[model samples]
Target: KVFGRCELAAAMKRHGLDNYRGYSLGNWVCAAKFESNFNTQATNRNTDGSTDYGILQINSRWWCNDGRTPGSRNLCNIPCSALLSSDITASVNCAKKIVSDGNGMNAWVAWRNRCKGTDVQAWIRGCRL
Candidate 1:
């Protein structure tokens, strides 16, 4: 159950993604799967939330508490609600920020090496009307 069907569709729509079948959706799903196994409830907290945390597995302490420039920790504690907002786009975008967005096209390569074969532009060609 990658995204429970409906969730994937909604996420695609939210991201303004026309491709929901082959690559665009595939890459997005791949990133989520690569990050936290698509478990929206996934969280990592050592003892009492000292290290990393949240659904996207964001390192909250390093962001909000630690004062990192790219660290936006508002959504680190709330997974479902974070995913509901456009702010969650930060996760995907952040990956691209660390790596070249055009390097692998969709940052799917950063998420998983397999996605390197999937071109972002080429993936959009399969968008579902």
Candidate 2:
């Protein structure tokens, strides 16, 4: 499922991302747009032989275990398949875990290149969120 920008924001807001760990809700929304274009099933493989999954593109290298990326840390302790679902609860929780791990949104290349140092209010500008 490809979510509308505001719809995604509302969902994140409802799931406790509004001001999660000093990052604004807009940061998560904006990062998701670049990471997965709001596509729930989005996946990408890296040159390191690891894969990123879902809306926030949680990675198999350090977060989830896909049983494909060898030596994975699996810090999220989540299966990669769960991240691809339209239900984004696990995705959001894992994102929080990543942030709490001290990387913050800097962990997401999309956020570093796109959402960082920019006005991100547009990500949640409407839809009553």
Candidate 3:
């Protein structure tokens, strides 16, 4: 599903991601914007052949099974497709797990490259939350 920035911010707020795992909501919002443009169906193949899934672009190498990555950790225990839903429960839960795994928002390359130290206020601009 596609979402506007405000819509995504509202949903993330409801999911308690505003300050999850020491990362601010703006960080999450900025990362999501660059990672998937709030499109839940987003997917991308890495140079290593692993695929990134969903809004947070969780990788198949350590997060979920894309049916091709060998010995996938599948830490989330859900299919990669589970992340490609508007509900976002599975995605958010998996994202938290990824953050808890010691990388923090760095788990998402988009966050490291684009959102980090950036003025992320634009991501949640005009959101009530």
Candidate 4:
């Protein structure tokens, strides 16, 4: 499912994830844009032979099991495909767990390299929620 930015923002707000864990909604929005462009079904193969899943691109290395990837920690205890849904509850919950695990926004290289310290207003611009 491909979501518009405002639609995604509304979902995040409904989940009470805006400004979650000291990270602004813009931070999350920017990360999502860079990670998967709001596509729930997005997936990517990492050079390390792991796969990133969903809107947040949570990696199979520690967050989920893609079955094709061995040695996954599966901390989210969910099938990777669960992240690829229009309902973002699972993805958001997993992301919160990941951020709590100490990496913060740095857990996502996209946030580190693209969203961090940048003018993130554009990420939330024109979004009412």
Cα miss at 21, model 3 (Å)? 1.4
lDDT of 3 by residue, 1-129 (tens): 998888888998898898888777889889998999999999999998899988888899998877999877898999999999889999999988889898688878789999999888777878987
What's every prediction's RMSD, in angstroms? Answer: 7.2, 0.8, 1.0, 0.9
Best by lDDT: 2
Estimate TM-scores for all models.
0.42, 0.97, 0.95, 0.96
Worst 10 residues of 3 by lDDT: 120-129
Choose 1 or 3, whichever is better by TM-score. 3
How many backbone clashes does every candidate have? 1, 0, 0, 0
Q: Rank the candidates by TM-score, best first.
A: 2, 4, 3, 1
lDDT of candidate 4 over 1-86, digit per residue (tens): 99999889889888877889998788888899999999999999999899998999999999998888776699999999999999
Q: What digit string (tens of lDDT, one per residue) describes model 1 on residues 23-48?
A: 45555554555555666555554454
Runs in model 3 deviating more than 4 A are none
